Design a protein around this nucleic acid. Sequence first.
DNA 1: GGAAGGAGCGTTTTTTTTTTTTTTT
Lengths: 315, 170, 98, 354, 335, 325
Amino acid sequence: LQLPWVEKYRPQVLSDIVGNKETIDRLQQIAKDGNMPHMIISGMPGIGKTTSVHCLAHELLGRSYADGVLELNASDDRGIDVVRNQIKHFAQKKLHLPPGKHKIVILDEADSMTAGAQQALRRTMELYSNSTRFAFACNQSNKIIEPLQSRCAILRYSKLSDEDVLKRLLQIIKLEDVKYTNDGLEAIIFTAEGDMRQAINNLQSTVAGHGLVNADNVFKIVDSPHPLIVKKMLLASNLEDSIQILRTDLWKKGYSSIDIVTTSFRVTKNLAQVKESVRLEMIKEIGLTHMRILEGVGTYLQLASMLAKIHKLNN
Amino acid sequence: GEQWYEKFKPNCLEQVAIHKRKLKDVQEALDAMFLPNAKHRILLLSGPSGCSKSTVIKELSKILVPKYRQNSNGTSFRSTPNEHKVTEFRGDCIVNDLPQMESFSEFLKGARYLVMSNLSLILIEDLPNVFHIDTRRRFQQLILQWLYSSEPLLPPLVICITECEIPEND
Amino acid sequence: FSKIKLPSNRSILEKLQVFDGDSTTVIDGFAVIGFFDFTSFDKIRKSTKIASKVLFRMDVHGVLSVNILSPGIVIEVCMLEKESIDEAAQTEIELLME
Amino acid sequence: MSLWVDKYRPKSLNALSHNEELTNFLKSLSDQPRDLPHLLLYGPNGTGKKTRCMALLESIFGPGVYRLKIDVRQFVTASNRKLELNVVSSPYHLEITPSDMGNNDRIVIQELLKEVAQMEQVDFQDSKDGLAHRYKCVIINEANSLTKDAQAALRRTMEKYSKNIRLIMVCDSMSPIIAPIKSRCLLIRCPAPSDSEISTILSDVVTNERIQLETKDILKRIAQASNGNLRVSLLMLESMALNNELALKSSSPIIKPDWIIVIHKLTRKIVKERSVNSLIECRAVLYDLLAHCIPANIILKELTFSLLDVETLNTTNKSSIIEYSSVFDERLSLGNKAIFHLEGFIAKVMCCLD
Amino acid sequence: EQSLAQQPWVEKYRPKNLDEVTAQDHAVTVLKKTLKSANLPHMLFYGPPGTGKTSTILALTKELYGPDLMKSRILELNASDERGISIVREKVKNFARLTVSKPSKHDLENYPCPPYKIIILDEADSMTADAQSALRRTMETYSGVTRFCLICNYVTRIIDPLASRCSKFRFKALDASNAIDRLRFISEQENVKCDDGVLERILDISAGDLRRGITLLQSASKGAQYLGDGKNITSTQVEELAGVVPHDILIEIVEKVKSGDFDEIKKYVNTFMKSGWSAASVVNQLHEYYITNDNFDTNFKNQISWLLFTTDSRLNNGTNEHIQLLNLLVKISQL
Amino acid sequence: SKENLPWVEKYRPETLDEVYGQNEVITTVRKFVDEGKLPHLLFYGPPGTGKTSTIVALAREIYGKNYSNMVLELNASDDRGIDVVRNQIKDFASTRQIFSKGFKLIILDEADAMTNAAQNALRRVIERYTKNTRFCVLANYAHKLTPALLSRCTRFRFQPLPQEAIERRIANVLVHEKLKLSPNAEKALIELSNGDMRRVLNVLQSCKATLDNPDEDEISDDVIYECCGAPRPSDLKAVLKSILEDDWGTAHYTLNKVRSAKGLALIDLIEGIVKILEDYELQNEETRVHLLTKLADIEYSISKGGNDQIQGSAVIGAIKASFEN
DNA sequence: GGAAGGAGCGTTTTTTTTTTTTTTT
Ligand SMILES: Nc1ncnc2c1ncn2[C@@H]1O[C@H](COP(=O)(O)OP(=O)(O)OP(O)(O)=S)[C@@H](O)[C@H]1O
Ligand SMILES: Nc1ncnc2c1ncn2[C@@H]1O[C@H](COP(=O)(O)OP(=O)(O)OP(O)(O)=S)[C@@H](O)[C@H]1O
Ligand SMILES: Nc1ncnc2c1ncn2[C@@H]1O[C@H](COP(=O)(O)OP(=O)(O)OP(O)(O)=S)[C@@H](O)[C@H]1O
Ligand SMILES: Nc1ncnc2c1ncn2[C@@H]1O[C@H](COP(=O)(O)OP(=O)(O)OP(O)(O)=S)[C@@H](O)[C@H]1O
Ligand SMILES: Nc1ncnc2c1ncn2[C@@H]1O[C@H](COP(=O)(O)OP(=O)(O)O)[C@@H](O)[C@H]1O
Ligand SMILES: [Mg+2]
Ligand SMILES: [Mg+2]
Ligand SMILES: [Mg+2]
Ligand SMILES: [Mg+2]
């Protein structure tokens, strides 16, 4: 069978990774130099953290990737016993590598590691840093305990810009010989919201669905991100407009009330235009509505009342 | 590819990045502890990550242990003077005939003997798995027994605890 | 990586045949490798404890069948092979066998 | 000897002396107790609800209901938390206060009571042939303090096992009782005794104890100070008699619960000075009161009604005070920590007064 | 005779068959025809207290299976049982997967014996949302051999997927118009002599709860028997037994509120709460008095309706009766 | 055996051709299986829209009638903790097909009930074994799914069922059974369905049960209202007219009579009146604010019980005060 | 002889269900 495009076109080299140009350039510098230190890679989902770390390890270790890399993630056993035995034995292993090269322990989703295992990793890093180096990958850098953070260079990935997403999408289209239009690519980028995994998934879905990537064809399957709809609903100057948006764009499309209220809270947390008093009052009203929904009254009437109270707060 | 924080590590107490008053307080406390009938048996150091607790402890030991260690009566393990000024507990050590929770209990039962001609400073930085309730209870019991021990001679015991918050985990 | 090799004698290994995946044509010099997770392979230990004879039969679809003969108790164990073998594992296996 | 509250406790229906209509209704209930429904007696605290329940049990069974012993029943939660409850038992009935277990009260309903309901009581007949069966009586003290889960667990236990068990619940207010539970019980209102009846009981006690009384006005004043609570009336009578060499006089002070005087002082301070520092001092007083395990709702009610008695305040101030009291009482009912709500009420009162 | 007279009237007169259930025909007809169609769906009975839900399900099970087969075809769980997520995932799932037990020849000849079991979850609204979610696919997967019956008073407490999976039956309130016949039959069976209109008054006071009405009738009968005068029961005695505030006391409260003096209202309320009247009954009587009064204007009625609603909600939250009553009376006085 | 089943299960779609109201999603998945390029799927939608039916039908189409041998289905009724993900799901996803029948399928129905730890463990299982396995997640609440899992899955939204699809399914059921439905009855059924086919099927089964002679009797809107005990539109209109035009006593009497005629519930009347008022043309916007706030408060109070008469009077007073602005 | 800079202060700790890790077996 044919692999999905997300996995089929996963980059093999750092040069094929787009976005965070300075960070990728630093990674390439490290790869071509060799003296890799303990590092932490943090950022939002689907921006190349796993791809970047794996490509760096591959380029650094060459043929010795199999015997010089130990990869562990949340799907494997990673308790304190694992740190005591498997990681310890790997770090103790005497492996002949080219000068400036070290064994790499990749801990993907390191944030999920237990407190005991994280504390145990301190002594391992202290003892075996001469021949072993650790590459943590996570979404929240603060979820790694401070003693471990103290030894590692931090590297934060930013959300991908529309330009890099468009460039890599054009590369994929050229490889796949996909017919498209500019508006279709713009719609795909808009719906991706900076997540390239979603961008590639939506591109594949659209290409399958109709063959031609148009805006209308893209929007037949992919929907506009609902956080923007919620923001438009909250910022409406008229109660009628807010109610109309809530009905047509959210309720009639099958969005659950709990999702709507959670998204409303998240969006209100980042409303720069509104004042602080109005913002906190809106947060209070949203929380009261959320409490009512959790009790079982997840009705459209409650959301309409929440919108009415928010509009009152605005006035 | 040596890391700078290790490559340029201090080689003497004068280069340790420590406030002068804190260094004086720690040095006086440890020196008093090294007395034959010292009032204090455990020195507990607490603070944030990377504030020179273990570094200053080791640098001070390098001076204090030779000063107070009794000269051997022509007896020693190997030909060399056995430069083991600091004895550290390892939390990842696993032996065949010992349950995990007893490991620390064993360590102290050995550390008790490092006095006089075998004088050494006991340092506890890599603690046992205190997140396990039973292990923490055993650790506390062992600490209390050391504090209340009737042994006339004991070596100075230093416990360095790095204080940090545990991020919420699923 | 460790190895346990059965002797080539008619008291522990009564017979062995490789059929090139069709049960008919015997081929010499070809090696068949089946990758399994021990959590499932070890489930036949209790059956083998009482077994008098064991017959292994692996097909091309990655299915391994173990027939255990202890008038008597007859056991059939069918297991699936893993998706694929890593390059490191293949290299280690080849080095062990050569 | 025993306190006069218990020394002169009536031990029969015919021994009752106030609320004769309630006594007649209880007697009518005991005429044919075979089909006695579950009972829920509600009324002001200290009016004699437990005494009347015991009198009804005595009429149904006999004086042996008053021979009470205490046992300890051990329960284990999901987290292995081991805890204990006191079960007061007589040969004919049982007494429990599940609210003593807080949020774990439901466990008591699910394990203990259910078992009591499931075990049919049978005994060999002394004269006739064959076994004889009798339903067990169970008293639930402080029914209104049960969590909603325990009340829900009570429903099918009451219904299915009606043959083997009859519940008699007692409460001071029915507001916290869920509707399904009220539907399953015969509701009995227990009015407080009038001042005249309290004075008569106190005078009878005085005559029994040979205490010299200058005038009967002292008993009336004690009854007024008790606010209809006969138990408090008797306790203060005993305290005043002992502190006055068993010779009461019109000049003898009336002893009130210490926390009540503390709340009165707090009200006076609140009225006098209104500022942040005054609020902090009031918080200190509130925390001291809570340290003695005084319920937060009781503290709020006492403080509110003490404030409403101040003469200097006007109609608007009192209206605002009662509004805030209602709002913060609801907040306490729906809340987790009482300090927030009491402090908020005091702050709102300070804002309105100033 | 004594054995039969050893039960409270509510349990003594619990309906035995579906024919005895009253005022709930809209669902009883479907349940009855299910005995012939053998096409019972998953059921969600919901309604206010004492409307006949548990009685209906018990009667349906008895009619479907019978005294002997029921013990192997019915699994009942209620609030008194542990119903955590583990219970739902293990015990309920195991019973739902159980093979249908073989009926005996007597059972087949005497009862329809449909080829499935029944799981009854009484007081289902007390179960947690996660535990409810654990039932979703168990109900669908084993619908060929198992049918679920959830019963509740607050339907909003049932998660939406479960409500969608279950056919819904709303039990109506039992009032003087639809439940009078059953109460009259019960009174006749017990030879309870009452004045004309007493049963209607009891039903009106019960406010949709036939269990409360039956208990009130039993209390009145006991009082009359103890008195032993041969006179018929009166509505005044029923009101006194039901905890209804006498009309004169309500009139006094109304005049005090009309006066508008805070101190007099406070003193009167302090004296009134000594009697122990339940605040809910007083609020209901005040609502009936004010809303139906023709001497007040529209604005007053709107404001008082909102005030009464707020006070009733606060009381339902389980608040101090004295404080809430005083606040309501003061607010009405300021209108 | 199908005859004894409830209609909700008796009429479960068996093939993708029987799933209505999801034309775009269905066409996309059908063509994906035709080209054998199925990606990891997420089906997000409200109850009773055809997610489980669609995924089971797709599995049947992919693997014919032996899908149960190469499809691993897990739902909320099963334990799906991190240990389950590590052992069972991982072993199934990392093993070869039974007869090399392309790729294996793992269905996680009601995945919004899974814990955060299990979802986090699922990420690398999904990514590593994409060649041999494909994952399908189904959900009603997206906020319970972690961002990584959402990013890994191609999203498809199951909208509330359109009217035409409901009419076609109802016609299919009516031809299957020997049942007759009136156009007004069908309109009422669609209106009360709220885009849920389960409700339609359950109400239709109850209506058939209600008929004395289903072989010839026709289902009218009155039968539907009786079975559901819901208010008629005329009752709602009369109640609203009395509230907005008559005096307090007349409105109270009208509400009491309308409720006592058929034992209607107050919450149903409130919902109907809210729906009616949502289309009202209001020249003052504060009226809408007051209506929404007060009616939401009354609904919340009703959800916890309370006094019914007081709540009805509250509804009347709230509407009158709101429209007095 | 004024800044500016820095140290020490300002602390204690079960509970509902449900899930998970750890340790000894
Ligand atoms: N910067 C990028 N350039 C090219 N392709 C990318 C990029 N980021 C993501 N992709 C695509 O998305 C796939 C997933 O990338 P990953 O690096 O595994 O995602 P991620 O950043 O690790 O997100 P998390 O933290 O694992 S949820 C890759 O295989 C690529 O196909
Ligand atoms: N001038 C210096 N002063 C102190 N530490 C230094 C210095 N130069 C390098 N280091 C190194 O910096 C590191 C930090 O010192 P540590 O004493 O180990 O930290 P800490 O205070 O003990 O906290 P933890 O528990 O180790 S995270 C050590 O590895 C030192 O060798
Ligand atoms: N419809 C009815 N027909 C006849 N008797 C009824 C009816 N409803 C209630 N009763 C009487 O009230 C008793 C209780 O009935 P139930 O069926 O338990 O009410 P309920 O709906 O279950 O109340 P909840 O919801 O558990 S508080 C019965 O034993 C009957 O005596
Ligand atoms: N699109 C549809 N076409 C035809 N019948 C449908 C459709 N959706 C639902 N149904 C009917 O409703 C029943 C339930 O459908 P499901 O697919 O199980 O509901 P659902 O979408 O999974 O909702 P949840 O998430 O499980 S509550 C099916 O067995 C059908 O009888
Ligand atoms: N009729 C009565 N005659 C004399 N004392 C009474 C009478 N009724 C109640 N009491 C007294 O009131 C006290 C408290 O009554 P109790 O039943 O505990 O109140 P509660 O209703 O709060 O349980 C008892 O100690 C009892 O002596
Ligand atoms: Mg990653
Ligand atoms: Mg250190
Ligand atoms: Mg019931
Ligand atoms: Mg489904």
